[PDB]
């Protein structure tokens, strides 16, 4: 990269490779994401160019967009660690509840902001959540399937994670609502608490059935319209819903209650980010600083 200096490769997202780089001129350290190849749509670059204005303390700042040679480069502010790494590093002891609560609260603030601006993330996962030494956590990547789509892998043979995908997506809904982000965040919340992914599916059907085995196979009573969904099959096994206290022990009732609302099957009953911020679980929220080893 003529203007930069790919310090190190720090990821390989579902579109391209992310590098840590220094602006040889400004000297600023940034995350540079290279995107795939035969001209690159102008509709996306306009969708992207729209993200530059989406600034919030809990959203990774998109600094520059550069189109050149069937290659699209996205320049983002750099953060030192992602939540996946932090969770793995905290696996022995667990992330303290107050920090879990702070991170959840901040991510809901970030989502309330995006959603009020009619922007959906669509692919929330621990690897797309970045943290710093000051205790902030920010939303990164944003997918962009409305300006690109769901990739078969990433760009070069890679197993896309389905663990955080909302059921309406798995059932073939063609129009996603902001509810898909609340579902993913609920899955991440559970994972921070238990130190185990909630629904670790290894295929779309296994992902769906893992959800059904835990929350019960949905029906018209809890999810009006579900049996008419594109990929719904009357032949799906009928599993009973599991007691919620068994899913995220030892989370307190306030936490369970909020998680249950973030995981409602019906996208329309699923709690909004705005409403979640008002939940009693956050009455005593604070902003602890994490112990980060960089
Ligand atoms: N695992 C690591 O050591 C690690 C180190 C530093 C990072 N730091 C990152 N900073 C930004 N801004 C990132 C992104 O904007 C991003 C994230 C995910 C997909 N696409 C773009 S990744 C992330 C991970």
Ligand 1 pocket test, pick from 76, 131, 158, 294 with the greatest ligand atom count within 8 Å of Cβ, gives: 76
Distance CA(10)–CA(18), nearest Å, equals 6
Q: State the DSSP string of 61-110.
A: -EEEEEE-SS-EEEEEE--SEEHHHHHHHTTTT---HHHHHHHHHHHHHH
The technique by which this structure was obtained is X-ray
Give nearest CA residue, ligand 1 atom 13.
Answer: 31
- Sheet of 8-11: strand order equals 8-11, 18-22, 29-35, 72-77, 62-67
Residue ranges in the chain assigned as alpha helix (H): 42-51, 83-89, 97-116, 167-170, 179-194, 204-215, 253-262, 273-277
- What tokens does 69 get? 């040679």
Give nearest CA residue, ligand 1 atom 12.
Answer: 78
Distance 277 CA to ligand 1 centre (A): 26
Q: Which residue has the tokens 């579900």?
A: 226
Distance CA(136)–CA(131), nearest Å, equals 6
Distance 139 CA to ligand 1 centre (A): 10
261 phi/psi in degrees, rounded to 5: -75, -25
Contacts (Cβ under 8 Å, ≥6 apart) of 80? 131, 132, 133, 292, 294
Enumerate the CATH 1.10.510.10 domain ranges in the chain, comma separated.
81-291
Distance 141 CA to ligand 1 centre (A): 9
State whether the beta carbon of 140 lies less than 6 angstroms from ligand 1.
Answer: yes
State whether the beta carbon of 223 lies less than 6 angstroms from ligand 1.
Answer: no
Q: Is the peptide bond before 250 cis (omega within 30 degrees of 0)?
A: yes
Distance 81 CA to ligand 1 centre (A): 7
Say whether 123 is catalytic: yes
State whether the beta carbon of 82 lies less than 6 angstroms from ligand 1.
Answer: yes
Classify domain 1-80 by CATH architecture.
Answer: 2-Layer Sandwich (3.30)
- Give the nearest ligand 1 atom to 85 CA: 1
Enumerate the CATH 3.30.200.20 domain ranges in the chain, comma separated.
1-80
State whether the beta carbon of 15 lies less than 6 angstroms from ligand 1.
Answer: no
Distance CA(50)–CA(62), nearest Å, equals 10
- What's the CATH number for 81-291? 1.10.510.10
State whether the beta carbon of 75 lies less than 6 angstroms from ligand 1.
Answer: no
């Amino acid at each position: 990269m003529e203007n930069f200096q790919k310090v190190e490769k720090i990821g390989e997202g579902t579109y391209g490779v992310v590098y840590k780089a220094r602006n040889k001129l400004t000297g600023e350290v940034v995350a540079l994401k290279k995107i795939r190849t035969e001209g690159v749509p102008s509709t996306a670059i306009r969708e992207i160019s729209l993200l530059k204005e989406l600034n919030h303390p809990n959203i990774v700042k998109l600094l520059d967009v550069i189109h050149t040679e069937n290659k699209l480069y996205l320049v983002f502010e750099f953060l030192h660690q992602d939540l996946k790494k932090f969770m793995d590093a905290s696996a022995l002891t667990g992330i303290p509840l107050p920090l879990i609560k702070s991170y959840l609260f901040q991510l809901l603030q970030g989502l309330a902001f995006c959603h009020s601006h009619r922007v959906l993330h669509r692919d929330l996962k621990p690897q797309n959540l970045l943290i710093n030494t000051e205790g902030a956590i920010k939303l990164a990547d944003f997918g962009l399937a409305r300006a690109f789509g769901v990739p078969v892998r990433t760009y070069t043979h890679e197993v896309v994670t389905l663990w955080y995908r909302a059921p309406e997506i798995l059932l073939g809904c063609k129009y996603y609502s902001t509810a898909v982000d609340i579902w993913s965040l609920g899955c991440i919340f559970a994972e921070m608490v238990t130190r185990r992914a909630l629904f670790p599916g290894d295929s779309e059907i296994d992902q769906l059935f893992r959800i059904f085995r835990t929350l019960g196979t949905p029906d018209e009573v809890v999810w009006p319209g579900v049996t008419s969904m594109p990929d719904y099959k009357p032949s799906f096994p009928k599993w009973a819903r599991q007691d919620f206290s068994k899913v995220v022990p030892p989370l307190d009732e306030d936490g369970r209650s909020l998680l249950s609302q973030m995981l409602h099957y019906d996208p329309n009953k699923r709690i909004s980010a705005k409403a979640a911020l008002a939940h009693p679980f956050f009455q005593d929220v604070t902003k602890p600083v994490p112990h980060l080893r960089l």
